[PDB]
Amino acid sequence: DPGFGSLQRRLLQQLYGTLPTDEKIIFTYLQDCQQEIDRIIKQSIIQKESHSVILVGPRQSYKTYLLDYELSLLQQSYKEQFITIRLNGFIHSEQTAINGIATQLEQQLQKIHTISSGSLTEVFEKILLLLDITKITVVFIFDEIDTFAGPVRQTLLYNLFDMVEHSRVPVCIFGCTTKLNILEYLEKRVKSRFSQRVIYMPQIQNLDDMVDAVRNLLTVRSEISPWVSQWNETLEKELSDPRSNLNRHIRMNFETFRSLPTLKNSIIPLVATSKNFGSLCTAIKSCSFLDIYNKNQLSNNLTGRLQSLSDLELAILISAARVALRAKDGSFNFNLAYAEYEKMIKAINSRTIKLWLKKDVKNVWENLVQLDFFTEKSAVGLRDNATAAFYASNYQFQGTMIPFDLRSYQMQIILQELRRIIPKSNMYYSWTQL
Amino acid sequence: NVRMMLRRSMYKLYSAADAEENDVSYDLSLVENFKRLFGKDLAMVFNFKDVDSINFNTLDNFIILLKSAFKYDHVKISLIFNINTNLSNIEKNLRQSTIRLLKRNYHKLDVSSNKGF
Amino acid sequence: VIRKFTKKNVARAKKKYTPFSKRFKSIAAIPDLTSLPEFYGNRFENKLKTTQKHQIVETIFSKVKKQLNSSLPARENEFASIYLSAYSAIESDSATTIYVAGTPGVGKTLTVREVVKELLSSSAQREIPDFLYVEINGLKMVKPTDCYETLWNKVSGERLTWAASMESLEFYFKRVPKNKKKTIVVLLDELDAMVTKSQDIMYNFFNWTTYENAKLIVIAVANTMDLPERQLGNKITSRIGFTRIMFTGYTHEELKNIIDLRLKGLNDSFFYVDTKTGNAILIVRKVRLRMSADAIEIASRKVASVSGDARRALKVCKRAAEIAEKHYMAKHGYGYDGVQTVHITHVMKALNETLNSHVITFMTRLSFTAKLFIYALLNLMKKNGSQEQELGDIVDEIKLLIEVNGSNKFVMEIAKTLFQQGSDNISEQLRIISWDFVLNQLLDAGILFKQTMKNDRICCVKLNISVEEAKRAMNEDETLRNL
Amino acid sequence: MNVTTPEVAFREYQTNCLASYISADPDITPSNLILQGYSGTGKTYTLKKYFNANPNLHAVWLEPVELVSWKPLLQAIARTVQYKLKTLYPNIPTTDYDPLQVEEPFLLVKTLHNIFVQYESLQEKTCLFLILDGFDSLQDLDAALFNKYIKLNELLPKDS
Amino acid sequence: IEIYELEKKIGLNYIAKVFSKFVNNNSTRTRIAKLNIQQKLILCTIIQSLKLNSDATIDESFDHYIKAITKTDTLAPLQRNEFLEICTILETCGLVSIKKTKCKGKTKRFVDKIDVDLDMREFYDEMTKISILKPFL
Ligand SMILES: Nc1ncnc2c1ncn2[C@@H]1O[C@H](COP(=O)(O)OP(=O)(O)OP(=O)(O)O)[C@@H](O)[C@H]1O
Ligand SMILES: Nc1ncnc2c1ncn2[C@@H]1O[C@H](COP(=O)(O)OP(=O)(O)OP(=O)(O)O)[C@@H](O)[C@H]1O
Ligand SMILES: Nc1ncnc2c1ncn2[C@@H]1O[C@H](COP(=O)(O)OP(=O)(O)OP(=O)(O)O)[C@@H](O)[C@H]1O
Ligand SMILES: [Mg+2]
Numbered sequence A: 001d002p003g004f005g006s007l008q009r010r011l012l013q014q015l016y017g018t019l020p021t022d023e024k025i026i027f028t029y030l031q032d033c034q035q036e037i038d039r040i041i042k043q044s045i046i047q048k049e050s051h052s053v054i055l056v057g058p059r060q061s062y063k064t065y066l067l068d069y070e071l072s073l074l075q076q077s078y079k080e081q082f083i084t085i086r087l088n089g090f091i092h093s094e095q096t097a098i099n100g101i102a103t104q105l106e107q108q109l110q111k112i113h114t115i116s117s118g119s120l121t122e123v124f125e126k127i128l129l130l131l132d133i134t135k136i137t138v139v140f141i142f143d144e145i146d147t148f149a150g151p152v153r154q155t156l157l158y159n160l161f162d163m164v165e166h167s168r169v170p171v172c173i174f175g176c177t178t179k180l181n182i183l184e185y186l187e188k189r190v191k192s193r194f195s196q197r198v199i200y201m202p203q204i205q206n207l208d209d210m211v212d213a214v215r216n217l218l219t220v221r222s223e224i225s226p227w228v229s230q231w232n233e234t235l236e237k238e239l240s241d242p243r244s245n246l247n248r249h250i251r252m253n254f255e256t257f258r259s260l261p262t263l264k265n266s267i268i269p270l271v272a273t274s275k276n277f278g279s280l281c282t283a284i285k286s287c288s289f290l291d292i293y294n295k296n297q298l299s300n301n302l303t304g305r306l307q308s309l310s311d312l313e314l315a316i317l318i319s320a321a322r323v324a325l326r327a328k329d330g331s332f333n334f335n336l337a338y339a340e341y342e343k344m345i346k347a348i349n350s351r352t353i354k355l356w357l358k359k360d361v362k363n364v365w366e367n368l369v370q371l372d373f374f375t376e377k378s379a380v381g382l383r384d385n386a387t388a389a390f391y392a393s394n395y396q397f398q399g400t401m402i403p404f405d406l407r408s409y410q411m412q413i414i415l416q417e418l419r420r421i422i423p424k425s426n427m428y429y430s431w432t433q434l
Numbered sequence B: 001n002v003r004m005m006l007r008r009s010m011y012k013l014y015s016a017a018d019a020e021e022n023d024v025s026y027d028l029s030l031v032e033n034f035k036r037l038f039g040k041d042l043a044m045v046f047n048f049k050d051v052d053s054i055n056f057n058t059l060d061n062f063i064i065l066l067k068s069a070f071k072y073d074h075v076k077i078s079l080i081f082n083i084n085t086n087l088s089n090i091e092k093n094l095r096q097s098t099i100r101l102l103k104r105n106y107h108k109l110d111v112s113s114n115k116g117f
Numbered sequence C: 001v002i003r004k005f006t007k008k009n010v011a012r013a014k015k016k017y018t019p020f021s022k023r024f025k026s027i028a029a030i031p032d033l034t035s036l037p038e039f040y041g042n043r044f045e046n047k048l049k050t051t052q053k054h055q056i057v058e059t060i061f062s063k064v065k066k067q068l069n070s071s072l073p074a075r076e077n078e079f080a081s082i083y084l085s086a087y088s089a090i091e092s093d094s095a096t097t098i099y100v101a102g103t104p105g106v107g108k109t110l111t112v113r114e115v116v117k118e119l120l121s122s123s124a125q126r127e128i129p130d131f132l133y134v135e136i137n138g139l140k141m142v143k144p145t146d147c148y149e150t151l152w153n154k155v156s157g158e159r160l161t162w163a164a165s166m167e168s169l170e171f172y173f174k175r176v177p178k179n180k181k182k183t184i185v186v187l188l189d190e191l192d193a194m195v196t197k198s199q200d201i202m203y204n205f206f207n208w209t210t211y212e213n214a215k216l217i218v219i220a221v222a223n224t225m226d227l228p229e230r231q232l233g234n235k236i237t238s239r240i241g242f243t244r245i246m247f248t249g250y251t252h253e254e255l256k257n258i259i260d261l262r263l264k265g266l267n268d269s270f271f272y273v274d275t276k277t278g279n280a281i282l283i284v285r286k287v288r289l290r291m292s293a294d295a296i297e298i299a300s301r302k303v304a305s306v307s308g309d310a311r312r313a314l315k316v317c318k319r320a321a322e323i324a325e326k327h328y329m330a331k332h333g334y335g336y337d338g339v340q341t342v343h344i345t346h347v348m349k350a351l352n353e354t355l356n357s358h359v360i361t362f363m364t365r366l367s368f369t370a371k372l373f374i375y376a377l378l379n380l381m382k383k384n385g386s387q388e389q390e391l392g393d394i395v396d397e398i399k400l401l402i403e404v405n406g407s408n409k410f411v412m413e414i415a416k417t418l419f420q421q422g423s424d425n426i427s428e429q430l431r432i433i434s435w436d437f438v439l440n441q442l443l444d445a446g447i448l449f450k451q452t453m454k455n456d457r458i459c460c461v462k463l464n465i466s467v468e469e470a471k472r473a474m475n476e477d478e479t480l481r482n483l
Numbered sequence D: 001m002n003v004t005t006p007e008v009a010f011r012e013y014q015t016n017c018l019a020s021y022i023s024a025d026p027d028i029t030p031s032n033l034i035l036q037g038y039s040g041t042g043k044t045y046t047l048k049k050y051f052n053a054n055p056n057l058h059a060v061w062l063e064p065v066e067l068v069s070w071k072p073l074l075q076a077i078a079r080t081v082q083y084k085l086k087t088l089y090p091n092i093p094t095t096d097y098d099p100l101q102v103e104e105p106f107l108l109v110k111t112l113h114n115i116f117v118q119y120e121s122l123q124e125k126t127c128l129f130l131i132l133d134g135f136d137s138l139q140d141l142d143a144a145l146f147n148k149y150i151k152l153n154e155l156l157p158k159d160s
Numbered sequence E: 001i002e003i004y005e006l007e008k009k010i011g012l013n014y015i016a017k018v019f020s021k022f023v024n025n026n027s028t029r030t031r032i033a034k035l036n037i038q039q040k041l042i043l044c045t046i047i048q049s050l051k052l053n054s055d056a057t058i059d060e061s062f063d064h065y066i067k068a069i070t071k072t073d074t075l076a077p078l079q080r081n082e083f084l085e086i087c088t089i090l091e092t093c094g095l096v097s098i099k100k101t102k103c104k105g106k107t108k109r110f111v112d113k114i115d116v117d118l119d120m121r122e123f124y125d126e127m128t129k130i131s132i133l134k135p136f137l
């Protein structure tokens, strides 16, 4: 049915936010924030005032969404008044930010109607020459701005806030960060040149904000399909009933995640896997696919990985756990776990399980290590940055030069958790006690 | 580490293939693109000198990395391990899946200083 | 040839390598450098220009905000000292160092620039000989040696690399006679930024001022008065000297005079405001603009208490004007395209948002799982006092708090959601639902610190925020303070 | 969504999810998609089945375990994207770019921008699926690497 | 010479005027006498926190200030941001230095640390002369 196809495609467009700019959905709890952002852009692109402001909010809290919506709104009516420079703190370094600014300056100025030629000294000198009938507003969007407010030296932030302060070129800088105390990151002169305009992004405060956001996400306000009115009636019947499955899942998200992108990531394959309109209405009334999605998202955690283990793997894991519980530091190796394992096999067989030899338990031990049940003792693991990882890659650790049966390990799951999630009918259940 | 192992091996591969008959990245994709860049099939023989001195975690990861070249249809890989202690010592220093991979086609060749006097 | 690695993005400047000492055969072969067409200073602006298709509505507060921008009523003694030292050293053809230090925004760069402007005016009246003014900012340099590239390029017009530039400047300051020279005044702004490990740049710049033929004025602007004692050697401290000029933060009366000087022509003045659009014209309604002396006084007293920083006082007044203009534009619906007063309420609201903390109200608006995490963390800090708690202990204590307050209504409705996500087909979970999500959320917020460890149980977690504001946010919640 | 769901035994939910997320229309396709499973769980097999059952989709296959470090991965992205775009539309004259010029993530952004601007004569918007099969199997992995890849789409042009 | 010609043979007094103009003349007592009673209380809690913790961040100093002035139940407490504001006033006066350093814990990260550069005898004498709010000394 092409009508259901059009309705499904429009629902997916509304969920991914890829609507045209005048049809774009702004949640009510995001409104007073975005109008505030709408002021600052309109004071910079139109009235040529210089602004510096940092947006502070968590990940997926609509900083980039609201900024992109503001730039799309200004681009439809004032497209010759401003240029856009985008920097990201993960991707740009302190050297490559200069080349990024200069390259974006030339590809934006040739789009309106070289700066980036030469060495980095000449490139920075040319940027300072350009930046330090009307003027074109330069709009900087600086995502992950906390990475450039380092303790060492904040050169780029100094020069950019000086461009806001003392330059005659109208410059608008929007920083974005998750750091709540971003103002303490700034150096004294950088903080003095900054305007201390910090906009804290709004949070969901109560349940009907989330229900209204879901209603805005799923109501179709344009006549794209014959099914639009019936889908709107079905959705309003689900959201108005406080005992419906949709309101129950929204409430659960409100008390656990409190995240609308988390809910959207589950709602999208509910709509997309529907084959006709009746299946979509049944799926939104029952929300059973949300339960299947929630089960799949938890399938590879510690609880779900345990249920994939064979009986020998479970026996070795139980033996290692009780050895680790008996240890003062929680440390164990292959030999102690094998000794505990053979003590349990002869204690069970005295009351017939094949007793696997030590040369065959090595494969089980390597599988248990690979499945993140044991960790090497005092191991750092994944390093925070590439420099520490490179430093660690040029050193040979003491665990990798001793034989494998003497390597010290620690459990990711303790014996009490093992007693909690292993069923009573399992025949190794009695050894999860001590 | 494994990165230096692959970089030295790929530099040796590109140097020999250029010396027989444009720069490249010294990783395994040169093994992937060898037939396009040189027009010939590839036979690599890896000679690991003094295996009883190498870090076996690094060697295990390098062998697992070299396993990815099996799907390229024009590459065949031979490994030579110069063992000075015993085969059983290097058996317990490697992962069991690596042993099962090496067991598919392997031979032993004993040449000491007085093999058979 | 086959390379071991490649450098495919090398961008090298067109800078020569031969220093100035090999530019002529002898010292006597050097011509008069003042009568040379490249010495002493003898294109991008139009790319940021376009045509305006509308008419910007400037409201009545827009002139106040424009006049409050950063683009000398309180600096008389500092101006006189710097100007007298520079005038004496220029007119007698000597070399000297002037040292200026202070906190941000106390008028250091502005006073030095005004001194240089007045000296250029006096040199245009043939009362002192001509000089070249060079401004080197150490925070505007990519590399610290580029100051060597900058100063020599300002002197000769050549473009050399930094070492050849340093030898060229050394030969110029030491060997070139004073009859063939011009005086140079160098402003070394952000002097701490040019401090390196070997301190060769600092020694060279302050040692060239000790040469008899140099004709060099180095005005070094710093941030602390004890920078040579803390960071520099004895040799550079001896060359900088004992006389140092301190720029004290402004008192509240001088901040009051600064703000009144920016608003001398605007305050208590009448405007013709067009009620159709909102556009105001300074001398249709006749509206008088007013900003309160009590408002300016309380903002100036607050700023002089904090720092005595003129940027902060101007920004606080501009923010108050912006708040009042936003309320005015909202109540009249004007757009962008009888007495208007910016009051002490707007000034206090500008002063309060810089002093408000969002950390407590951020924590009170989190989900129940994040608040439960923070509450269990505070419980573990109360139990053992370690201030760093392992994550497995937090897991066990969350489980304990769920099974101990099991008869609570909210807890007995929350337990199925927390451990099974409201589903019978989902097994009981070792972590709560959204455990990783709230852990990473508190780490990105900066509320939490987590050590770099690969075992999830023994990994420690620390409060980065203060404990009592976390306790205040926990007692704000209804459920957590009852159990 | 107009796409084929192949029958993969014991992976029906995963194949339905892949049909939900992977489509030829860029407006209803996520910028990032993660498949997570341990060794031998049939992730590669069902992604192969899905893309062979939908041959109109344009997929580029990369193996990070053969590249070891971040810089060869960036160079491999530039090389394979440019070669795939060359064989996809042979009637489009393109200036070739050297993948060894990519030494920074910013250089990858610039190189992808320069490669993508010589294809604006195409009628419809088009997804190019870059598959990093085994991202965490990269030998020089650190925690900051994945953030660059998930924020990479914000620096590319939006109307391309 | 410069001091002489900025006011108008050079006398004995002008050397002393130079040696009074260009020495800082720290004078901790006169710095303390310009403070308020609340600011003196925060300064006392800060130096007590540095006494008993010896590497204390601003948050632990604020925490100690809160518990120490709720033990007294006079001068009802203020919030953390205004605590940092009075710390900034104290840094402007010349009694407190705030720096950015690394922790020595298992979580080694950057954090703002607080330190003093004042003599203890003048501090203790000048806030025993206050003679009302004792137990923070
Ligand atoms: N330009 C855009 N067009 C459509 N949707 C967008 C756009 N930018 C972001 N979104 C969506 O908005 C939601 C909020 O995420 P967003 O990227 O705005 O967060 P953010 O606050 O910028 O996060 P982070 O701090 O991680 O950068 C997500 O579901 C995202 O897909
Ligand atoms: N006496 C004054 N009269 C008028 N405006 C002043 C005065 N002092 C400072 N200002 C204003 O404050 C701004 C900051 O002054 P300035 O740039 O000289 O500070 P600074 O001491 O060099 O600071 P920083 O160390 O941050 O560079 C000036 O550009 C001017 O707008
Ligand atoms: N559902 C299935 N139906 C049929 N054969 C399957 C299925 N799943 C896996 N296989 C077989 O098992 C092999 C291994 O699966 P596959 O390579 O996809 O695993 P993987 O999860 O991608 O592993 P790795 O992380 O080690 O690369 C496949 O090549 C195929 O022969
Ligand atoms: Mg973002």
Ligand SMILES: [Mg+2]
Pocket: C108, C109, C189
């Ligand atoms: Mg300055």
Ligand SMILES: [Mg+2]
Pocket: D043, D044, D045, D133
């Ligand atoms: Mg695979």
